[PDB]
Every structure is written in C-alpha cells, then in structure tokens.
Amino acid sequence: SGPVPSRARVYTDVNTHRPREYWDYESHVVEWGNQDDYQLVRKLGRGKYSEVFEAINITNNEKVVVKILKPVKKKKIKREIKILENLRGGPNIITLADIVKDPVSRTPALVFEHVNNTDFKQLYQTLTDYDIRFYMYEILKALDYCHSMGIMHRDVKPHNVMIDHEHRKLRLIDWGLAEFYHPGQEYNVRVASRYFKGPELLVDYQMYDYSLDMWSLGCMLASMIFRKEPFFHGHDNYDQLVRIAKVLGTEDLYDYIDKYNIELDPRFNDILGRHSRKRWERFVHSENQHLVSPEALDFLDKLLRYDHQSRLTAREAMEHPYFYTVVK
Numbered sequence: 587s588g589p590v591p592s593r594a595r596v597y598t599d600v601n602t603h604r605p606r607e608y609w610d611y612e613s614h615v616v617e618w619g620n621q622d623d624y625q626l627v628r629k630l631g632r633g634k635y636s637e638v639f640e641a642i643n644i645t646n647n648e649k650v651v652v653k654i655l656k657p658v659k660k661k662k663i664k665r666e667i668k669i670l671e672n673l674r675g676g677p678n679i680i681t682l683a684d685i686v687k688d689p690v691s692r693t694p695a696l697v698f699e700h701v702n703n704t705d706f707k708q709l710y711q712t713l714t715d716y717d718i719r720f721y722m723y724e725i726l727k728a729l730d731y732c733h734s735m736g737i738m739h740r741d742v743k744p745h746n747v748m749i750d751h752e753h754r755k756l757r758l759i760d761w762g763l764a765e766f767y768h769p770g771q772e773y774n775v776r777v778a779s780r781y782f783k784g785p786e787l788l789v790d791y792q793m794y795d796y797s798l799d800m801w802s803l804g805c806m807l808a809s810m811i812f813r814k815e816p817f818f819h820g821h822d823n824y825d826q827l828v829r830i831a832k833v834l835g836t837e838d839l840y841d842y843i844d845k846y847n848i849e850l851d852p853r854f855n856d857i858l859g860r861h862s863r864k865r866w867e868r869f870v871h872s873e874n875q876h877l878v879s880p881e882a883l884d885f886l887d888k889l890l891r892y893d894h895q896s897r898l899t900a901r902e903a904m905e906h907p908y909f910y911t912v913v914k
C-alpha cells in the first residue's frame with residue numbers, strides 16, 4: 587500500500603512553470619571568476635563539505651567569505667551554486683559574489699558577501715522580546731522568498747543565520763542542503779541538524795516540502811522565548827522524536843503517522859511511551875517570562891505541529907499578531 591502522498595499547500599507548482607534551466611541544476615554551466623582577486627586571511631572553520639575562510643577581494647578591498655568545497659557529493663555543488671544564483675538579491679538571502687577554482691584544492695570555491703555576525707550562544711542571551719520578534723520577521727522574509735522561488739532551505743538553525751546586530755541586518759546562509767521543491771518528489775530525510783529536524787524526517791516520510799523549514803523555525807523560536815538551548819534536546823535521531831512526543835504528546839503523533847499511512851520504526855515501540863500534549867505555559871519561568879506573550883505562544887503552537895500540512899506557511903507566519911508590535 588505504502589505511504590499516502592503529500593504536497594505543499596503553497597507555491598506547489600512554481601518550478602513546473604519555470605524554464606527547465608531554472609531547476610535543472612545538473613545542466614548548469616558555471617561562470618568562473620578569477621581566483622587571484624581573493625587573498626585568504628584566516629580560516630574560520632570547516633564542516634563536512636567545505637573549508638571556510640575570511641578573505642579580501644583585492645580589487646575592491648572588501649572583506650568576503652570563501653568556502654572551498656571538498657571533492658565529494660558533487661551533485662550538491664551545482665545544486666548549491668544554482669540555488670544561490672536563483673535567489674541572489676532576495677530579501678535577507680546571502681549574496682554569492684563569485685565562484686572561482688581554488689588552485690590548491692582544484693575544486694569550486696564560493697565567494698560570499700561578508701556579514702558581521704555574533705555567536706548565537708552569546709547573542710541570543712541578550713535578545714529582548716522586541717528583538718526576537720524583529721529578527722524572526724527578518725528570517726521569515728528570507729523563507730517566504732526562497733519558498734516562493736521553489737526552494738526549501740532544509741537546514742534552518744541558529745548557525746545558519748548571520749546577524750549584524752549593530753546594523754539590525756540578517757542573512758540566511760549555507761544553502762548547501764537546499765533543494766528545489768517538485769510536487770510528488772521523494773527527498774532524503776538525512777537533512778537538517780538533529781535538534782531542528784522535523785517529525786517528517788524523524789519518521790522517515792520522504793514527500794516533504796517547504797513546511798520542513800517552518801518546523802525548524804519553531805524550534806528556534808521555542809529556544810529563544812523559553813531560553814532553552816536546544817528546545818528539543820535529543821541524544822540521537824530516535825530520542826529526538828521522543829523529546830518532541832513529551833511536549834506535543836503521543837496521540838497526535840500516532841494520528842500523524844496514521845494520516846500518512848506511515849509505519850514507525852519498531853524500535854520506537856519500547857522508547858516512545860505515552861505522553862499527553864503539554865500546555866506551552868509548562869515551559870515559562872521567572873527567567874524567560876519577559877520573552878513570552880499569548881501571541882508568542884499562539885504563534886509557536888502554529889509552527890510546531892506534527893502534521894507538516896497544518897503548519898503556518900512563511901507568509902501566514904508574517905500575518906501573525908506576534909509581529910503587530912514590530913515596526914514595518
């Protein structure tokens with residue numbers, strides 16, 4: 587029989603009305619810049635797929651960020667490049683300034699605009715109620731834009747949000763896990779970082795959509811307003827679902843899997859237990875009360891739903907009373 591199919595409730599067929607070239611990233615021909623324009627200054631770190639450097643563009647004297655891609659999962663390289671080009675200029679989307687071949691690695695190196703970020707661990711401790719609202723609204727601008735352009739980010743988390751708090755400026759970065767949304771398409775569930783993974787990923791439901799990003803944003807919101815980092819603190823991908831079930835309850839979880847004719851991994855049988863849905867007030871205390879309001883709680887509740895179809899869209903989120911106090 588198999589799982590019941592799903593489609594996005596918004597921007598469903600945006601890519602089908604595009605030229606093939608827009609989404610067929612495999613056919614994309616990279617336009618290469620000159621590597622000698624960029625002088626590496628220091629290494630900022632490296633992940634699974636790349637090494638990241640602060641650099642200078644010696645032609646304009648500007649600071650840039652250079653991500654030198656490792657020679658692996660090369661399908662991702664043209665996918666990221668194409669998405670960055672498609673989204674360039676969009677609200678709060680990081681700007682790809684250049685693509686060059688690194689002489690040492692012989693691999694593509696992506697050159698981005700510099701953004702003056704502060705450690706989210708340090709920064710979130712300082713955010714006022716107003717600032718959480720403000721920056722949430724800025725993230726939503728980015729998400730509604732990429733979703734409208736037929737793209738899901740799939741790795742929304744604090745590390746992928748660069749905030750210049752001095753200039754009240756925000757950019758959504760690291761589009762290397764991003765994909766084009768095509769209705770009916772089955773996607774890899776091995777995306778997002780543990781604490782930000784949606785229930786759809788955790789129960790191995792492949793026919794997911796933009797709404798994945800909205801769960802991830804809800805996890806961010808919960809962590810900020812409740813000052814609990816992370817909000818859902820799983821030991822592994824299985825315990826992650828259990829942590830979610832302890833807040834949202836097991837009956838709505840079983841209703842979700844029943845709706846999509848999904849079968850839980852049988853290892854959950856002995857660890858999931860039975861849990862009531864909690865009221866969001868359970869998580870409020872003297873130290874976080876100033877960040878919590880009825881509006882915040884209602885908005886959070888509408889993001890953190892098991893059913894990906896039930897979650898607020900980015901545009902719906904922007905309509906929420908929580909943002910009425912934020913100056914437009």
Ligand SMILES: Nc1ncnc2c1ncn2[C@@H]1O[C@H](COP(=O)(O)OP(=O)(O)NP(=O)(O)O)[C@@H](O)[C@H]1O
Pocket residue numbers: 630631632633634636638639651653680698699700701702703745748759760
């Ligand atoms: N557009 C940008 N402007 C300024 N700094 C950036 C930009 N993009 C990334 N960085 C910085 O570069 C550093 C490393 O980049 P990133 O690609 O996230 O590697 P990473 O953090 O090692 N990945 P992981 O170890 O898997 O979490 C981060 O700490 C960022 O602060």
